Structure formats: structure tokens, C-alpha cells
Design a binder for this molecule. Sequence first.
Ligand SMILES: CCCCCCCC(=O)SCCNC(=O)CCNC(=O)[C@H](O)C(C)(C)COP(=O)(O)OP(=O)(O)OC[C@H]1O[C@@H](n2cnc3c(N)ncnc32)[C@H](O)[C@@H]1OP(=O)(O)O
Ligand SMILES: CCCCCCCC(=O)SCCNC(=O)CCNC(=O)[C@H](O)C(C)(C)COP(=O)(O)OP(=O)(O)OC[C@H]1O[C@@H](n2cnc3c(N)ncnc32)[C@H](O)[C@@H]1OP(=O)(O)O
Lengths: 359, 359
Amino acid sequence: MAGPLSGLRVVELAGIGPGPHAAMILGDLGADVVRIDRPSSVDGISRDAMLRNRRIVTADLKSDQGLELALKLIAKADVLIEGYRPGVTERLGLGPEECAKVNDRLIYARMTGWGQTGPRSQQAGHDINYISLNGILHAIGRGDERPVPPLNLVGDFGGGSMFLLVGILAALWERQSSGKGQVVDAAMVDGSSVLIQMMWAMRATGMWTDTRGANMLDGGAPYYDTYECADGRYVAVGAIEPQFYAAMLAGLGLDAAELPPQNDRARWPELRALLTEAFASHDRDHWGAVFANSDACVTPVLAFGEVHNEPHIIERNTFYEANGGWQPMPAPRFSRTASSQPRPPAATIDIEAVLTDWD
Amino acid sequence: MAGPLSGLRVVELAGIGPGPHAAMILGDLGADVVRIDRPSSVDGISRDAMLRNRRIVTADLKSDQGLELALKLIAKADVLIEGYRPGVTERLGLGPEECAKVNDRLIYARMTGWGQTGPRSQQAGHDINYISLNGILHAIGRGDERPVPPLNLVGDFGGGSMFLLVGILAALWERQSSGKGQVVDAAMVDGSSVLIQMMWAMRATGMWTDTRGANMLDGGAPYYDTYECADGRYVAVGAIEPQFYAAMLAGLGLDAAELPPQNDRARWPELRALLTEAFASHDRDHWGAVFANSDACVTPVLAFGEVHNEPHIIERNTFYEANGGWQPMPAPRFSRTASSQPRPPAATIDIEAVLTDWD
Ligand SMILES: CCCCCCCC(=O)SCCNC(=O)CCNC(=O)[C@H](O)C(C)(C)COP(=O)(O)OP(=O)(O)OC[C@H]1O[C@@H](n2cnc3c(N)ncnc32)[C@H](O)[C@@H]1OP(=O)(O)O
Ligand SMILES: CCCCCCCC(=O)SCCNC(=O)CCNC(=O)[C@H](O)C(C)(C)COP(=O)(O)OP(=O)(O)OC[C@H]1O[C@@H](n2cnc3c(N)ncnc32)[C@H](O)[C@@H]1OP(=O)(O)O
């Protein structure tokens, strides 16, 4: 298996959202990922591409034999991922202490939204809920409107799977010197708060407010926002640095002297009206051409379906073709031990076969 | 130093955005992190709480002495982080090939937006630019408006620093076999694309469209969105699974028999109108009470300033106090080798004293 994580062994108890994503990236980077699902949900070659780079086995973990078969996998493995409510793995007899009996070296990786304990620890939830509680969701969207969910990118993946991964791999490093595994408690409400640490810093130095739509990076700044163009498509402007901002104005055809100052926030509505009129006067592709090779920080805002036609995307192979269409190639990239193209999710294999393979 | 990354030595060529955030987290988890800034841009004790868990040293890398002192630190370190345009470290004599000759165990971590090559590799940018090209930005916001940036959460941090961290830690794992370092190429356009792999999968199977504001997780679903309450504050609804949706309806006082089906998309306008009116009839804190300890997936949308009074946040110590402002505690959490409270920014230290300390 290609990638820096060649020979890492990972057992994934099938859940939803962050756990599968973390498991995927491990797979992507060449880890040996065995996913235990329940026989009831498994009907054919699973067609969720988030289950790439896996071997899928079924096993009723409530049966005596399914438990036993699972503890044998875990004994042969480096990392266990689970994404159930607290208590769940314990009652299956798959809890951290049961696992430590058969393998004191296991990285035991617990992926929740609310954490392992506390008043909300048994509440069901999705991304939108974890980010509502810690300030993040309130800060996203236009000021005159209700907050908008940034898909499930921030709680599940950014503040969720990714911290699970940082924990699994930091624990593996610690183990190199201690001989021992341990438990990683990755809570989305915690990870996403670290993910947004820059805002908490800026709030302390009076550089961020709790008003939605009134900040440098939330869409409130005329030089950090999207603009609608003549064809109804959009560009993104991110010209924070004054030098980049100046280059943008020249390219728009605007004389900096007739404008309010870049950072005079009281005059932001006025500045925005002037930039809005300028961007609206040509189409998106025009601006893409005009600002190619510039530091103006102006880029076309592409829909998913257009991304495969963008030179910079094509030439770095950020995507590979599959199945219905494009999927992202592994990230990040490695000079010596390079990941390879993901393997699609294969037919269910039998859990004994896997045990043979790992003896 | 407390945490799983105790003993890891890290050299950070001072930059902005992802590279400092990645460096912060390594320090958060116990790494010994040394940040080389230019003297040009230092004055006293920093106020930027993203520079916690850090030693700061200054050094004109353009000079012969600076270059040589930098190369000494790098010789004695596990990891180098740089976030400059491609070619910068090469030109400065701190490129991968130059570092490899003084330390072939080094993990050489390159944090960019566009990548090390391709047509956009020299253009300036920020988060909004990198997520504009790979389809992400176009997918965020309401259907009747231009896209709204999800702060800088998706490109800088979730799709940036976090992939940098996974690459560093994956490469460190690999170095346990090989005895050799390597180059990690983390580009925000690639990282963020993997962060959104779910949507690429669902697009392939017809379960996600390119229309903004018309999908399950982008605000288009009445049961995954925010709602305005009587007091003008908001709740979040994430009641995807039918059993949780049912619990929400009961809490709202709506009988299922008077509503359209939860997933009859043609009648989402009606359903939204019904939920809207119901949520609008009481204030946020009413809903928060009703639905505490429930699986209804309804939570208050708190502002930064209110977070510190939420019971679940207090009890798990998701935050600590520091300099007239709360800040997030490290994530994730480790059972045996727990992180400690971050150390605030300190005054600059002499680069010699660091070399001495490190031998
Ligand atoms: C396609 C589009 C869908 C996209 C969804 C988006 C995802 C997001 O936005 S993140 C949301 C998920 N949140 C989390 O994962 C946080 C932690 N997890 C949870 O809170 C819960 O797992 C939750 C709410 C998601 C679902 O709750 P629920 O279905 O009650 O499951 P959970 O309580 O975890 O327990 C699962 C049960 O399956 C059982 N089980 C698990 N695997 C097996 C198996 N192989 N065989 C037999 N039983 C099994 C467990 O034993 C447990 O049973 P029990 O009734 O004894 O406790
Ligand atoms: C609140 C405000 C903060 C904003 C935060 C948000 C950030 C985001 O949303 S993403 C971050 C931006 N993008 C990236 O980091 C991607 C990669 N980086 C870049 O594209 C560039 O660094 C960029 C565009 C940020 C800045 O560009 P620019 O200032 O031209 O720097 P760049 O070309 O990288 O070169 C850095 C310069 O510093 C010099 N330098 C760096 N360290 C030193 C040193 N210690 N001593 C001497 N010289 C030094 C280099 O020599 C080089 O100068 P020159 O070209 O004159 O030799």
C-alpha cells in the first residue's frame, strides 16, 4: 500500500460523519483500514465514495461471536475508531478497558460531538448543533439575516475528523517512546473551537465583534467578500493587504483617490457600492482573465461542475475521475512516500479472511 | 512539557494563517516550537494568542549570519514549517535540498494555498480565493444571494493547517521505519477539497446539486437550518433522522398529521412556513429548555460572548481565561498524556540560547 502510513492498522466501527472521514484519510495515506459494519445495512458494493480505501466486514457486535471476532481484529491493530454516543462501545464489551486487555498498545479513538461526559453527552446532534453552542454558527452569514450553516465542513470535518486524525497520529508518536496506547477524546465542540482560535484571539484584542456581517473575514469587509458579475456569476475578493488591494482597484479601473479608505469601516457601505458597480460591469470570466497572474486576490467562484475545467485544478491532479465523476485525490502530498489513487469500496469480505491476512 | 508530542522539536518560519495555526496546535500538544520571525516585524510581547506555546526568535534570513543560525536550529529539529510562496525558501538557502544536507530526518512542511506548482502557484491569495476555485464557496449561503464566506475556517484551518498537521504526523510515523524525513506539500485547495469529499460523493450519486441553498446540509432542508425566535435570537435544527425530527415536532406542538412529509422536497416551502411560525412563537431560551436532554437536535445559537455561561462548555473546560478573553483549550484530549493549559506569548529569546538549550 502506497503512502506514509503504510502498515498502520486501523479498525473502524461504522458510524456517520467524522469517524468515516478520519478513517478515509488514514486509508488515503496508505493505512490498512478495516470497517466493521452491521449485517443489516450492507446490500452490495457500497456506493458512498467516503468508504474508499477500506475493507468492509459485517458482524453483529451484539452476538458473542461477532464480539469475539472483533476483539481479535482489535488485538491485531494499531488504532480503533468509534463514533457512537458514550457508553455504547462499553456495553458492546468493546470499551477502552476491554480493548487494553487484548492490546495495551491500541490508540483508542473516540469521535463525538459533545464529548465523553457532561450534560449534553447523551444528546443526539449534527454538525449544525455542535457549532451553535460555541459561537461559530452565530458568526456565519449576512448581518440582516439568520445564520447560515457552512455545510457540515466545520463541526464534522474541520473541527471533528481532522482533530481525531491529529490525535490518532500524535498518540502514535507518543507510543513510539512509551510502548503504550491511550484514549483520544475528540469532541467536535472542542475541535471546532480550536479551529476558530483566531477569532477568539482577535476578540480579545478588540479586533473582532459578535455582530454578524461586521468583520474583516465574515463578508462585512468590501475587500473580503464575493461580488456578482454581469453574467450573474461571482468572483471572490480577498485583498486584505493594501498592496494587493491597490492592484485590484487599478484592475477594476477605479482611481483610489475617489474612494473611501480601505479600512474606514464607517464608509464600508459606500466603498462596497462602488466595488459592486465595477464588478457588475463585466462577466466572471473577464475578471478571471484580467487578474490572472496578479496579486489582486480576485478569483472566479466556480460551481462543482466547472472545477474539472479549471487549468490549475487539472494540472495539479487535485481530482481523479471515478464512478459518477470526480473525487479529491488524497491530501496532503508527500515527496518520498506518495499516496496513490484511492481504491473504490469493494464487496464485503469475510472477517476471518482479514484475520488470516493479519494472522 | 505536557502532552503526546512532548519532545517534538519544531521550527516555524513565521507567516500568516495556516502555518501559525498548525504550529500552535503542535505546541498545544507538547511540541517544542521555535518561531523565527524577521526583526523588522517584532516589538515587545505579542498580543496574538495564536502565538501561544512558542519561543520567538528574530533573524534576517537574507544575511549570512541569520541563514547560518537558522540552518543550525533546523539541523537540531524534527520539523520545519514554512508558508511562503514557492521558491522563497529555495532562494533564501533554506529549501528542502539545503535542509536535507544538514538533517535528513527533517520533516519539511510546506503550507500554501495553490500548491508548489501550476499556473496559480505564484498568485497571492487568502482563504476565500482558495475555496472559490474548488467549488466550496459557491455552495455556501442562501439561494437568493451571493455566496458568503464561512469565515476563514474552511481553507485556512480545516483544509489548511489541519492537513499540514496530519502530513507532519503521518511523515513522523513513516520516519519510524525509514529513518528518513521528507517534504510535506499541504495546499489549501487540495486539503479543503478532501474536507468536502462527502459532497463530491453525494454529487456522483445524485444526492447533492450545484444549486446553492437547495440541499440537505446547506440550509435548503427545513429540518437542517437555523430559525428566528420571538426575541430575534436563533436556534439550530439538525433533526435529520426521522426519530429526532419526530421528537422536535412534539416539542414544537405540531402534529405530524397536519404537516407535509419531512422529505417531500416539493412541499418544503409549506413545511418551512409551518416550522418558522412555530419557532417564532417563543424565545430562544424557551426552546433551549424544552429540548435540553432531548434527541430533537435543537440547540441555541450562542454568540461568542454568551458561550462562557453555557453549562456544558463550563463543565468540560472547553475554554480557559487569558488576557481579558476566553480561549479554547487544546484539542483533542488524551487519557494518559494530557495537554496542559497553553503558555501565553513570551518576550523574544536569543537564537543562541535556543541552540544552547537544544545542545
Ligand atoms: C447521507 C447523509 C447523512 C449525513 C449525516 C451528517 C453527520 C453529521 O453532520 S455528525 C452527526 C453524528 N453525530 C455524532 O456522530 C456524534 C456521536 N454519535 C451520536 O451522537 C449517535 O451515534 C447518533 C446521534 C449520530 C445516532 O444515535 P443512535 O442511532 O442512537 O446510535 P448510538 O446511540 O450511537 O448507538 C448505536 C447503536 O448501534 C449498535 N451497534 C453499532 N454497531 C453495531 C453492529 N455492528 N452490530 C450491532 N449493533 C451495533 C450499538 O450497540 C448501539 O446500540 P444501543 O441501542 O445498544 O445503544
Ligand atoms: C488580520 C489579518 C491577517 C490575515 C490572515 C488570513 C490569511 C488567509 O486567509 S491564508 C494566508 C495567505 N496565503 C498563504 O499563506 C499562502 C502562501 N503564502 C503566500 O502566498 C505569501 O506568503 C503571501 C501572499 C501571504 C504574502 O506574500 P509576500 O508578502 O509577497 O511574501 P512571499 O512572496 O511569500 O515572500 C515572503 C518575503 O519575506 C521574506 N522573509 C521572510 N522571512 C524573512 C526573514 N526572517 N528575514 C528576511 N526576509 C524574510 C522573503 O525573503 C520574502 O521577501 P522577498 O520576495 O523580498 O525576498
